């Protein structure tokens, strides 16, 4: 009858970081 706690802050922080990192994957083409 003991309640445990969950810790998923690493996964959340990683999701936010990847959200930010995807900006670097946007395509900015060279004008021909």
């Amino acid at each position: 009858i003991n309640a445990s706690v969950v810790n998923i802050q690493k996964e959340i922080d990683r999701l936010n970081e990847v959200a930010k990192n995807l900006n670097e994957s946007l395509i900015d083409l060279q004008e021909l």
Partner: protein, 55 residues
């Protein structure tokens, strides 16, 4: 023909960038939801623990 190819490249890039924007939104929403769930789960765990300790 080279102009047609460059225009196709611009089409592909525009569609890809829009998709990336949507995916980023989905990532941020998932992070927000996971955070809220973590907060409530731990709050209610502390609330069950308190109930046990006060019974």
């Amino acid at each position: 023909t080279q102009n047609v190819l460059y225009e196709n490249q611009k089409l592909i890039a525009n569609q890809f960038n829009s998709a990336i924007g949507k995916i980023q939104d989905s990532l941020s929403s998932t992070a927000s939801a996971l955070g809220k769930l973590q907060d409530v789960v731990n709050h209610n765990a502390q609330a069950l623990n308190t109930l046990v300790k006060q019974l």
